[PDB]
């Protein structure tokens, strides 16, 4: 392709490298998706003399888009639940406990107490983290 979306050209290169690493892996003889959570997988099956991925394409296109629609209904609801009493505070209390931050306290902080190439890197990593 010509990478029309030049916007992500450097990111595309990062994905190409990772994708190539997977192509070079011995992760074969696997019937399972090898997935647990996150991104929605589907049978875009290609690089073989059957081309079933076309059905997969048409499914995503023709049915656009109950995945995100449901997601909206859920999120919109989530916000509407938070809008009421008690739910409001339960969220606040949880958020506050998850991230507690006060005068001169510690923030989430990278603790590099395990082996590293060099203490110099440990400082670089912490500076980047900040």
């Amino acid at each position: 392709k010509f990478n029309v979306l030049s916007l992500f050209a450097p990111w595309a290169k990062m994905d190409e490298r990772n994708f190539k690493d997977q192509e070079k892996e011995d992760l074969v003889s696997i019937t399972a998706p090898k997935l647990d959570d996150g991104a929605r997988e589907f049978e875009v099956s290609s690089n073989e003399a059957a081309s079933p991925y076309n059905a997969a394409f048409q499914t995503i296109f023709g049915s656009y888009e109950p995945g995100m629609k449901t997601t909206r209904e859920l999120i919109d609801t989530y916000r509407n639940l938070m809008n009421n009493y008690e739910v409001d505070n339960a969220v606040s209390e949880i958020v506050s406990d998850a991230i507690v931050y006060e005068d001169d306290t510690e923030v989430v902080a990278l603790n590099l107490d395990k082996s590293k190439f060099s203490p110099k890197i440990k400082n670089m990593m912490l500076d980047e983290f900040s």
Binding site: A49, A50, S51, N54
Partner: protein, 40 residues
Amino acid sequence: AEIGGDHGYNATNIAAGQTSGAVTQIGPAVMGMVRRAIPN
């Protein structure tokens, strides 16, 4: 002197494994197959 002989270029005989000699064949090994590409 026994011979192998050969096929008559008759795809039927070839597929069957028939030749003019002393020994029949199993049949042609299959090298693979090609499915017409799908239009974009």
